[PDB]
C-alpha cells in the first residue's frame, strides 16, 4: 500500500547482487504482502528483463522471506506477516556485464487482507531509476 | 484430480509425500491442506502440530477461492511434500487432516478451477 | 558503513511521523547491529533534532530502531546481523515548513558484538527541498 | 493552520452585528493564541472592512468575542488568547445597511501563534462567497 | 435547530479526514448542542457506516469538543454551551479506501435546554448532504 | 458496581499523570466513571484544597476512555470484568496540600442500573 | 531505586492485553527511568512456562532504548515516580504460572547508569 | 562536516587526535571544543561526579579564530585536516569524569559557516 525504493552500480553484476532495496508499508491491518515488477517476465515468476533507456538487464525481486506467488491472478513474490513494513531487494538475475545508463521501471504491491484472504482494492506503484 | 499420498521434535523435512495426476489436458496444479491457516493441525483426543505443503517447484497461491500452492504445467503428474513448519515439539495423540488438489485450466496463463476436486486423508501416526 | 539517502517531495503542514527522507544503512563485513544519527542540534529525546532553513524544522530518525547511547554517542540502534536496515527521517510532531531547503547529514556505523563502535563511520547528506 | 468558512442567502436588510458567516480556525502544532483577518480594505477601525460586489459595497467586521482587535507585527486583525485547538469566529454586518443582492467574495487568513511569542512561517487562507 | 452542511472532492482516506463540515445554529436560549447522523451505527456512538449508491464508508461525527452522548435516549455527540452556534465535522473513521460514487449524509441536531441538566427541545433539524467520491 | 482506588508527587507536575482506579463489573452487563466541578471539558475537573479556596486541574480516563454524557463522565465499551483507568493532571501546573476526589462508576447494560469511592492525594 | 509489582482470566491473548502493572521510584533527583525484563530477548520478550510465550513491557510514555549497554524501555523526568505495564502483543494462546523477573534503574544525565539496580519478581497465574 | 575522533594518569603535560574531512568543495576548516573558555582555542573542562583541566585544540597548522561568534581554523581546499586535543601545560588532575565534545565545519569562500556541523564527544576518568 506504500512503497519506497532506494537506488544504489558499475557494469559487472554478479548473481544475486543487490541493485536496489525496497520497502512496502501497510497502514491498515493485514495478513501478508505481495509485490512485483511491471516488466516482461523472464523465466520463473519474479525474474524479469528491463530495457536500457536507449541494452538489457536481467533482474529479480525478493530476498529473505519472499517467494514466488500467484495471487488472483497476479504473479509476484509473497511474504507472510501482519507487521507494518517489510524489506525487499531488487537483485541481479545472473552474472552479467551491463551497459551503463538508466534502466527505469516500476514496482507494485499490496497488503493482503482477510475466513478468507483477499487482494485490497488499491495497489501501490513506485518508479525506480536503476543506474549502471 | 487424482492424488496419491504416502519422533517428537523437528525443524525445517518430510511427514508425507504425494502426487497429483491430471489425465485430461490442463495448464497447472493447485493443492492445499484442509486445516487452519502453512497450517496448524489440531491434536486429537490440545497441542498444535505445524505443517506446510509443497516443495518449491511449488508457489504460494490464491485462486478464486482457495489459498494453497500451485505449479504451472501441461505435464501429467506433479510430486509434493508435507513438511513441518519450523522448529517444534510433538504432543501425543493422533493428527488427522487432508490434502485437496485440482488440475487447473486456462478463457485465455489465466489459471481457473475445474469442476472436479481430489481429496486424500492422513491420520498421521506419530 | 555504507549509507544511501532519498528525500520525499511535498508539500506545508507536516503531521507527526511523516517521512521527510528515507535511508539505507548497509554493512558488508559481518557485524552485530546498526547505529545511526543526524549531525544536527539535539532537541529533547535522543534521536530527535532541529534543522534550519537556508525557520527551523523538528525531526526524528529511526522508525524497529531504539534510542541509544553507545560510548557516549547518541543515535538510534538496532540489533541485526542482516546486511542492511532501512530508516526514516520523520517530522517530530505537527509543525509547518517554510519553503526552502533543509540539509540532513546522517552518520552511521556497523557495530560489532565484542557493543563496540567500529573505526570506520559513514556520513551522507540529503537535502529536503520544500 | 486550518480555516473553514460556512455562510449563513442573507437578504438585503443587514442589521448591525448580524451573522453573515461562521468561521473556524484549527491549530495542530502547540500554540499560544489565535490570530485572524480579512484580506480587504480596512474601513474605520481594525477588523472592519469594505467588500465590493462582483459587479455596490458591503460593510463587514470580524471576530465576536472574545476576539479583540490586534496588530501582530505587522498584521492587523483580531486576536484570541488560548492553547485550545480550534476557535470559532463570525463575519458580521458592520452597521445597519441595505445591500444590493449577489456575491461578495473575499478571503480570510489566520495563524496559530507560538510561544516568547511570535508568528508562524505560514498563514492559512480560505475564500468565502457571501450571498446577499 | 438550524443546520447548514458543506462537503469537501483520491481513493484513500486517512483517519480523521474531513468529508463534510457543518454548522448548528441555535437562535433561542439554550445550554447545549446535540447532533447525530441518520445511518446505521457502527461501534461507538456516534460512528457510522454509509452506503454508496450501488461500498461502505465508515464515518464519525463531532470533533474537537464533542463528547459521545445518550439523551432521552437519542444517541449522538454533544457539547455544552450557551453560544449561538457550533461547528462539527463528518470524518473518516479510520484509514480506508473509497469506492467512487455518491454518499448521502443525513444529519440531525438539537439545541439542548437545561431545566447543566440537559433536555431535548421540541425542535429538531435534519439536513441532507451528498458526498461525491 | 465495584470500584477500587489508589498514590508523593512534589510540587512539580506535567500532563499525563498513578492514578489509579479500577472498576469491577462481573455480573452480566459497559463502563463509565467520573469525578464528583464543571470545567468545559468532560470529564476534566478542578479540586480545591484544605486551606481556604488554591485549586488543581485534573482529568480522568487515560487510554480507551472517551468523554460521554449518559444525564451523567468518561466511558469504555467492553464486556470484560474489570475496567482499568487513571486520573492525571490537566495541564502542567504548580501546587503548594490535600485534595480529595469522590470517584464514581457504573455498569452499563443491554440495548444504554441503580458505586462511590473516595481517594485522597498529597503534595 | 525501588520497584513494586502486581499480577492480574482466560486463555486467549490478543494485543496490549495487560498481564502485570508495576511502578518504579527513584527517591534521589535524577533525569529518568529505565526498566526491562530479565528473559532471553527491543523491549519485547519470551517467558517460558515452568512451551513458551511472547511479551512486551512499558506502554504509555515508554520507548525502546539501549543504554550502555542494557536494552530496555525508558522515559525522562525528575518525577520521583513512574508507572508501567507488562502486556501481550498481538493474538496468541496461553497454557499455569509464568515468572517475570523485572529490573529497573533511575538515570542521571551526567544519561548514565548508577551502581544501584532494582529487581523484582512477579507471578503470572493462568 | 565529517570528523573522526580517536580518544582514561594523575599527572600530564594528547587526550585525543582527529581529522575533519570535507568532501564537497570548501575553502577551509573550522573546529572547536564545546566547554567553557579559558587565548581563543584554549578551554577549561569541569568534571561532574570541583576541579578542572585546561585543554587546547589544534596543532599549529591551525590559527586562533572567531567566526560568527564562535575555535581554530585553517585555509585550504584539500579534503582533510588533522588536529590534536592536547593538555594546556603541566597540570594535576583529581579523580572524576571529564566530558566534552569537539565540532567542526567546512568553511566556504563564497569565509562563513555552512548549515552542517559534525560533533564527537570525549569522556575521561584520568
PDB file of C-alpha atoms in Angstrom, chain F residues 27-74:
ATOM      1  CA  UNK F  27     -22.448  -9.585  36.642  1.00  0.00           C
ATOM      2  CA  UNK F  28     -23.957  -9.859  33.103  1.00  0.00           C
ATOM      3  CA  UNK F  29     -23.652  -6.386  31.574  1.00  0.00           C
ATOM      4  CA  UNK F  30     -20.442  -1.051  29.620  1.00  0.00           C
ATOM      5  CA  UNK F  31     -18.244   1.045  31.902  1.00  0.00           C
ATOM      6  CA  UNK F  32     -18.423   4.733  32.723  1.00  0.00           C
ATOM      7  CA  UNK F  33     -16.835   6.608  35.614  1.00  0.00           C
ATOM      8  CA  UNK F  34     -16.340  10.223  36.673  1.00  0.00           C
ATOM      9  CA  UNK F  35     -15.179  12.570  39.381  1.00  0.00           C
ATOM     10  CA  UNK F  36     -17.748  14.250  41.650  1.00  0.00           C
ATOM     11  CA  UNK F  37     -16.714  20.644  39.177  1.00  0.00           C
ATOM     12  CA  UNK F  38     -17.709  21.544  35.643  1.00  0.00           C
ATOM     13  CA  UNK F  39     -14.810  22.891  33.623  1.00  0.00           C
ATOM     14  CA  UNK F  40     -15.661  22.928  29.933  1.00  0.00           C
ATOM     15  CA  UNK F  41     -14.056  19.599  29.071  1.00  0.00           C
ATOM     16  CA  UNK F  42     -15.851  16.467  30.166  1.00  0.00           C
ATOM     17  CA  UNK F  43     -14.543  14.900  32.110  1.00  0.00           C
ATOM     18  CA  UNK F  44     -11.848  17.318  33.225  1.00  0.00           C
ATOM     19  CA  UNK F  45     -12.127  18.689  36.741  1.00  0.00           C
ATOM     20  CA  UNK F  46     -10.841  21.095  39.382  1.00  0.00           C
ATOM     21  CA  UNK F  47     -10.453  20.160  43.085  1.00  0.00           C
ATOM     22  CA  UNK F  48      -9.927  22.703  45.875  1.00  0.00           C
ATOM     23  CA  UNK F  49      -7.510  22.384  48.780  1.00  0.00           C
ATOM     24  CA  UNK F  50      -7.984  22.118  52.552  1.00  0.00           C
ATOM     25  CA  UNK F  51      -6.708  25.638  53.133  1.00  0.00           C
ATOM     26  CA  UNK F  52      -9.041  28.445  52.055  1.00  0.00           C
ATOM     27  CA  UNK F  53     -10.147  28.331  48.394  1.00  0.00           C
ATOM     28  CA  UNK F  54      -5.746  27.172  45.887  1.00  0.00           C
ATOM     29  CA  UNK F  55      -7.062  24.519  43.480  1.00  0.00           C
ATOM     30  CA  UNK F  56      -5.967  21.938  40.897  1.00  0.00           C
ATOM     31  CA  UNK F  57      -6.676  20.954  37.251  1.00  0.00           C
ATOM     32  CA  UNK F  58      -7.464  17.241  36.733  1.00  0.00           C
ATOM     33  CA  UNK F  59      -8.866  14.702  34.205  1.00  0.00           C
ATOM     34  CA  UNK F  60      -9.961  11.025  34.273  1.00  0.00           C
ATOM     35  CA  UNK F  61      -9.746   8.025  31.883  1.00  0.00           C
ATOM     36  CA  UNK F  62      -6.433   7.591  30.061  1.00  0.00           C
ATOM     37  CA  UNK F  63      -6.293   5.291  27.036  1.00  0.00           C
ATOM     38  CA  UNK F  64      -9.515   3.696  25.850  1.00  0.00           C
ATOM     39  CA  UNK F  65     -11.730   6.197  27.675  1.00  0.00           C
ATOM     40  CA  UNK F  66     -13.830   8.683  25.728  1.00  0.00           C
ATOM     41  CA  UNK F  67     -15.765  11.644  27.124  1.00  0.00           C
ATOM     42  CA  UNK F  68     -19.517  10.989  27.323  1.00  0.00           C
ATOM     43  CA  UNK F  69     -22.917  12.023  28.613  1.00  0.00           C
ATOM     44  CA  UNK F  70     -25.247   9.192  29.534  1.00  0.00           C
ATOM     45  CA  UNK F  71     -27.552  12.642  32.451  1.00  0.00           C
ATOM     46  CA  UNK F  72     -24.108  11.747  33.783  1.00  0.00           C
ATOM     47  CA  UNK F  73     -18.006  11.258  32.800  1.00  0.00           C
ATOM     48  CA  UNK F  74     -15.794   9.156  30.547  1.00  0.00           C
TER      49      UNK F  74
END
